[PDB]
Design a protein around this ligand. Structure first.
Ligand code: SRM
Ligand code: SF4
Ligand SMILES: [K+]
Length: 456
């Protein structure tokens, strides 16, 4: 199990060819697994560092995870600057020994594809006239919980304030250091930033950050999110360039009979001008394709099965690795999702909502890697074939879903969703999401202050 440091998920075609080779020749599974933190993993490594180092990649005493960056902004020109900053924060934070692992992101509204509320530190980009002028800082997100332990909880990030671009690194360092200093020294399950904030208070923590950074936060500048999904298919970028985002189920890249996904990506990498971008939804973007090259790229993706059409539901569903490789797995996630979504697709069709989607995620255990604690419908593994069903998040991911039913099986889960999707399809207002509806309709009480009301 090896994972690479790849800020913003940007990887070159040369780097791709190198990782594709190693994956096929030096691992048990032979696959490339795209993660939801915009990087990749090999499974069952049978030397990798030399391979990495040779193509300029470095495999991550360091409590630091991959720094995320919105992959395909509507305003395409903003990506270059934002990415530049994600890369700088990444290198800046690179080795202090943090108690727990620290997760950071750079977000470009109105997209929350990187799922900011699952992270310790977030810089929401504010642009004026096509140029980034600063960041709104949100601190304190985290999703890991422990079954039945009411002292643990998922928490959304808190707004601290706005800072000019020039203060970015000073602020990044200051948040890291006060968490390091104030973080719980006695217990690891309470060492994360979300716990520290609740213990000392946001304002107390905020004041310390200003003190250390040598700045005073300005008031938060307006920002809104409209979604978290990728933009599957072709989208027009800057100049004569186009971006093709490929939906990859579970981000598992392998050649399947009649679906040579892995070889197809290699062929594209051989002729692709620009580079690739691994998304926070475990998908892949063939970035910067000249209009002249569109048909060539599309031909390979099409033939390889990389452009096989799926429902909007499937495009908005996610699961963690879980079995067979995860040592902490309680229930299947990745291997369960495909057939589970097959069933949800039938349910959506039955109720006349085949064109709709519900952000649905399955996580193999409460550690929460699948980000089910930010979904409209989240399934959390409790034991083989059994999950806790959570309802009530929203499409943009700013609300934690409360547990609706505990320790139930797939058949029981489907029966409940059949009933609820049916009600939503008929009783929902115009453009109302499933999560919001369950809260509006009184099907589940919302989680308003996680540290205090997440658990019944
Ligand atoms: C691959 C990935 C899920 C996926 O299907 O994409 C993943 C996979 C695993 N995670 Fe994670 N996590 C992944 C995103 C996350 C997320 C979501 C996110 O960051 O966007 C979370 C929830 C947010 C959070 O941190 O609160 C998450 C919370 C955890 C935890 C709980 C940490 C905690 O604070 O309590 C653990 C266990 C631990 O580290 O103690 C963990 C542990 C693990 C390990 C490395 C298991 C281990 O400790 O040995 C899993 C490897 C499974 C395997 O065989 O590949 N993973 N994990 C993601 C890899 C991200 C990356 O490239 O770094
Ligand atoms: S949520 Fe649990 S089962 Fe899934 S990858 Fe994370 S640690 Fe493993
Ligand atoms: K995916």
């Amino acid at each position: 199990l090896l994972r690479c440091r790849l800020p913003g998920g940007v990887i070159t075609t040369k780097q791709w060819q190198a990782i594709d080779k190693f994956a096929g020749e030096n691992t048990i599974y032979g696959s490339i697994r795209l993660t939801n933190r915009q990087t990749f993993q090999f499974h069952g490594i049978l030397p990798v560092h030399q391979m990495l180092h040779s193509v300029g990649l470095d495999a991550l005493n360091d409590m630091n995870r991959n720094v995320l960056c919105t992959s395909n902004p509507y305003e395409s020109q903003l990506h270059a600057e934002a990415y530049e900053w994600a890369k700088k924060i990444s290198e800046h934070l690179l080795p202090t020994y943090l108690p727990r692992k620290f997760k950071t992101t750079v977000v470009i509204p109105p997209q929350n594809d990187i799922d900011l509320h699952a992270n310790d530190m977030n810089f929401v980009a504010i642009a004026e006239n096509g140029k980034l002028v600063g960041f709104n800082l949100l601190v304190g997100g985290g999703l890991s919980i422990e079954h039945g332990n009411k002292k643990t909880y998922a928490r959304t990030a808190s707004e601290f304030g706005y800072l000019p671009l020039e203060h970015t690194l000073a602020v990044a360092e200051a948040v890291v250091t006060t968490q390091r200093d104030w973080g719980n020294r006695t217990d690891r399950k309470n060492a994360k930033t979300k716990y520290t904030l609740e213990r000392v208070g946001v304002e107390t923590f905020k004041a310390e950050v200003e003190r250390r950074a040598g700045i005073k936060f300005e008031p938060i500048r307006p920002y809104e999110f409209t979604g978290r999904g990728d933009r599957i298919g072709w989208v027009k970028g800057i100049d004569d360039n186009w971006h093709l985002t490929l939906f990859i189920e579970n981000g598992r890249i392998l050649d399947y009979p009649a679906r040579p996904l892995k070889t197809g990506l290699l062929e594209i990498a051989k002729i692709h001008k620009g580079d690739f971008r691994i998304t926070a939804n475990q998908n892949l973007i063939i970035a910067g394709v000249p209009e002249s090259e569109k048909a060539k790229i599309e031909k390979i993706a099409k033939e390889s099965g990389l452009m096989n059409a799926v429902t909007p539901q499937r495009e908005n569903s996610m699961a963690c690795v879980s079995f067979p490789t995860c040592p902490l797995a309680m229930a299947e996630a990745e291997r369960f999702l495909p057939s589970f979504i097959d069933n949800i697709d039938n349910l959506m069709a039955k109720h006349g909502v085949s064109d709709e989607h519900i952000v649905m995620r399955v996580t193999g255990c409460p550690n929460g890697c699948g980000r089910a604690m930010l979904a409209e419908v989240g399934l959390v593994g409790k034991a083989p074939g059994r999950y806790n069903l959570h309802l009530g998040g929203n499409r943009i991911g700013t609300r934690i879903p409360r547990m609706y039913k505990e320790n139930i099986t797939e058949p029981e889960i489907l029966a409940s969703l059949d009933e609820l999707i049916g009600r939503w399809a008929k009783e929902r207002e115009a453009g109302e999401g499933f999560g919001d509806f369950t809260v509006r309709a009184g099907i589940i009480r919302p989680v308003l202050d996680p540290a205090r009301d997440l658990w019944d």
